[PDB]
Design a protein around this ligand. Sequence first.
Ligand code: HEM
Ligand code: HEM
Ligand code: HEM
Ligand code: HEM
Lengths: 282, 282, 282, 282
Amino acid sequence: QQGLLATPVPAHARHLFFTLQSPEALPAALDALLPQVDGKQLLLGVGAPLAKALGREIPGLRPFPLLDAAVENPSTQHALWLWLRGDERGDLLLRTQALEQALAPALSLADSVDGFLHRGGYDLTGYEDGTENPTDEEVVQAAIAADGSSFAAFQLWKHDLQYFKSLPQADQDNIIGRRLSDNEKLDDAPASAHVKRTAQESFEPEAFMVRRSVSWADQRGAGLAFVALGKSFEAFEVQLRRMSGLEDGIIDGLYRFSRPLTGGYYWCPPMSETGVDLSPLL
Amino acid sequence: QQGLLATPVPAHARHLFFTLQSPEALPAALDALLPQVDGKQLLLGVGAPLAKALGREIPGLRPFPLLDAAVENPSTQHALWLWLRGDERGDLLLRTQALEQALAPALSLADSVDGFLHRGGYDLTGYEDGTENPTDEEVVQAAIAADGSSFAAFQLWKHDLQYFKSLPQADQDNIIGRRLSDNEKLDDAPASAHVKRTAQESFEPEAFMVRRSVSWADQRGAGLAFVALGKSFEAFEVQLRRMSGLEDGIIDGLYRFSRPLTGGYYWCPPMSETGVDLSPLL
Amino acid sequence: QQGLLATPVPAHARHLFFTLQSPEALPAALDALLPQVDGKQLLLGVGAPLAKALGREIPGLRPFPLLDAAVENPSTQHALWLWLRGDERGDLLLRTQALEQALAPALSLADSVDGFLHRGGYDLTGYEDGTENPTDEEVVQAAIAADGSSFAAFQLWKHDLQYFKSLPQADQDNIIGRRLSDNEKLDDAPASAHVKRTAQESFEPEAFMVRRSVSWADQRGAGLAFVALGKSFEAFEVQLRRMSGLEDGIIDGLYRFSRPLTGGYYWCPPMSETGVDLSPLL
Amino acid sequence: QQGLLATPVPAHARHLFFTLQSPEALPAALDALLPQVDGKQLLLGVGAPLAKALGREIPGLRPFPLLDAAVENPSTQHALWLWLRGDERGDLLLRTQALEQALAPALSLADSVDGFLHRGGYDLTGYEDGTENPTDEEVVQAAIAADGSSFAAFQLWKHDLQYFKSLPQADQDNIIGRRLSDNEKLDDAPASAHVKRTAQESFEPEAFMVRRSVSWADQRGAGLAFVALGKSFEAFEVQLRRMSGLEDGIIDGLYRFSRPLTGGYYWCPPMSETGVDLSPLL
Ligand code: HEM
Ligand code: HEM
Ligand code: HEM
Ligand code: HEM
């Protein structure tokens, strides 16, 4: 298993997404990338088109779903995902440039996210995200599968901070479901509150998930880079359909000030005694 | 019917895409937008989430499909599409700013494309696109349905012009399927050639489509804003699955230098005697 | 003389600015650029640092001035200026990419402007700019010097169209100095009106200038790409100091909704019988 | 005196630059800005156009100079400079948005720089900048004037890291003047080496300066946000003219891979017992 759960998470992150355009050059790119995948500073996630391009099908791996709902959750599935973690923001910028060159011409950089951990684990709106994460011994049970693989879901949410912060504090709390002044759950908030929509125990058959989100800021705006780890995509997909109003006509309140710009499913390979284990994909 | 087929197409275009975030303000936005939808200078297309948000389901309208293939065709379905056509590039920039304000706060601008018709109907690579479009009397038959509605598919393709133009002229012709020097079909080009993949008569049960694409240039790069009109999405979707290698393991050659950045299905409402006919959606 | 005065001006323009960073490669770049400088589709202007890097000083050529005033006129002097004119917007985008490669590594692209002529010669605010340009036989007298050279001043003004158009029509007319409804001069507009500040006959010793501005739109916003030709920079510099409030404490009204982002002086070489004449610079 | 010299410098910075466009609203903006200027987390610097707009002239304050040289040092003088320092990158992004709103409509944001201290005080090229800064007791003598004011010079340098790092390590060391492997001065490096050009003791009449630069990364690229404090601009201006080749025809080697994009002079007001002292400007 990689270090998708190590605490504390470094102060900065960098999410890279690549499109496979020259498959004949892929062996040369993998021979220079895999010796660097340590699982702690550089994490790897295989996307559905990369498995499909190699003809081998990975169990549980599939593209980001298409949700015919009243809210827009885009499916921007890419072939490869590189998760860079580190305290030095400049070192992550230098390494992503080195990774971008070593992967060409097989993989072209399709998306990049300059992430940072805001106030140890707070969203830019001030609300502490990650409060209801499973305990340190429940995390491995909920995020890791049998082989040691994890199935991660990424979503780049763009916030309208000027609009959300202009609303009264009661309206902001009813959207999140928690008080900003003390992080206490509003037990009588509307069912459209985010914590009401995503109450992990409210889903009768489904289980929990391990979130590893960070904040971001670009020319595209700012918001939260949502990361959800789990032994399968079932925990995340039942949540997103619940938030989108598919389980019942109630739409999550987050969609009033924030909307996801990207979305993808990526299978995180296990860590063997010799680097990252991509043997099932050969 | 709107003016989706009028010839000649103006020298400039502007494609606007909106996300519905404040549905309570939608009646105020529609009362200022619909009197402007003339069908010739301003065209309208309803997206699946907009029909789903109103509870009324439009026959044939559905989100952009998810294609589990070795190539990436993103599904960036939005709620509303505004197609602006005109010869004055500055007038289209002034009008999109006026449309952006009149639609707030019900609809927020999610995507915008500054389009232009390059050399009367040529792609930036120099290849004449639109040669095999149906004749002027076959267009209405292939693009318009029974009621007068059309089902359009939009895709923002980003070109790597520095890479495509660096290849030898024979390699460039084998990717397109036509000679650049005379627009003649290479009858012995690989089946992965774009004209070989999209031979409208090669699809045994399916029909044709009416393309109305234009070129674009942004900070995101440059390429082709692909527009495909038809009486249904069946003509376009069978083409894209063919290009993606789903019908047979042959992937279109366009994916070696170009990749789509967006993708959406939009139902174009008919034109009654009093403006645009959105009666089925009420 | 080049074609800096040809009427009508093409519907699109492209202004390229280069910084000289590898001077040892300059001879290789000039041998591929000068055979293309026709004066009509591709115009050239030498900047002060390029003349200073070659040790030869051109009479009249100097960097864009520094105006210690209450308004900001930046001095973004570059080494080389390429003025591309043409009706096909896509052809100008393809040619600037070819010019960018042929000039490397001697000259790196420092700035680029995608310009268009709005409504034949109107500013995005609707006001017709170029009404008081000298007549077709006075233009050569006011723009061309003895040898056939012209001294051009470039300024990239960024408009706040949302603010200017929100003001009442009387306030907008008092800023420009002309009525928007009929392009008639407001003889009792404040002296801070743009036409009052730039009345070419109000400058007692100075002469006129020939303007060749176009509109632009970028990720930086939109506005006017101001071009002022003349037999010397004296006509333009006395205007800008007048607008900045240096001649008298009255500041031009344009600075309330627009501000220049760049600024540079460039000497346009004459056209001999064999291409562009850069002989004085050798 | 403000906290322009406090050690250690926080891990992140944010430089904001404003243009005065609505001077009638300036009193309302100052009454909300000055109570926040603490000198440690929020620093303030007055530009020449702001002093000129108020009619009061500050001794020593003048716009960024115009250097007629073979290299381009732009003069992008603005009216107001806000220097935000803090360890939380997200808090600086939230505060710059609050400062941007409280300053409107008097001051519009003209430029913004998201800065970070790379590896405690290293440039993105790996070279330790700030080694030859004056000692902790020489800093106040070299940076602070009689009243407690400081005169700062800002320059946004954009690096070509892909080009500088492609050169051999000996070429990179000859440009900087120090070995990358041990930060030791190359006593026989060319006079065009940056440390050879900027040897603080080589300037016979002039003194030293206190640098407080940080690294940056934007859509414009990446590089160093150069900050030079001093009791006057004489120390910095004699350096820049030396680097530009004005003192002798030797041009600094930094201009081969990096070029400044902005440039401005700003007078830092002293700190009285009641906030920032802007009394001379009234
Ligand atoms: C803009 C996007 C998002 C924001 C601002 C956000 C913010 C928050 C906040 C502040 C909390 C409260 C912390 C806690 O109760 O532990 C929370 C809880 C949670 N969120 Fe999100 N979140 C976002 C996206 C998502 C998405 C898309 C999902 C799932 C598809 C998700 C899943 C969860 C879960 C499972 C919880 C735990 C709540 C509980 O167990 O009671 N989050 N989120
Ligand atoms: C970067 C994207 C694209 C480029 C550069 C491009 C370019 C071209 C060119 C140069 C032709 C030859 C003109 C002709 O034979 O009429 C052509 C034909 C055609 N294209 Fe595309 N195209 C693109 C995307 C698409 C897509 C995504 C589809 C369908 C899903 C499509 C459908 C067609 C069809 C139906 C034809 C007619 C070919 C025939 O009937 O023989 N195009 N395209
Ligand atoms: C945002 C920037 C600018 C805008 C929107 C603008 C717009 C206009 C307009 C609408 C006119 C009236 C047309 C006419 O009277 O011929 C005009 C006139 C003129 N402008 Fe500008 N202009 C700008 C910048 C400048 C600058 C910076 C200068 C000189 C330094 C300049 C020089 C002139 C001159 C000489 C005239 C002729 C007025 C006369 O002779 O009565 N323009 N401008
Ligand atoms: C891209 C821009 C720049 C880079 C990468 C850079 C980098 C460096 C480095 C690595 C050093 C060696 C550290 C040391 O000796 O203390 C240095 C020294 C120095 N730099 Fe820069 N610098 C830049 C811009 C400037 C500018 C524009 C100036 C002045 C106008 C300046 C003034 C100095 C001074 C005074 C020293 C001290 C050298 C000595 O006293 O021996 N720097 N710089």
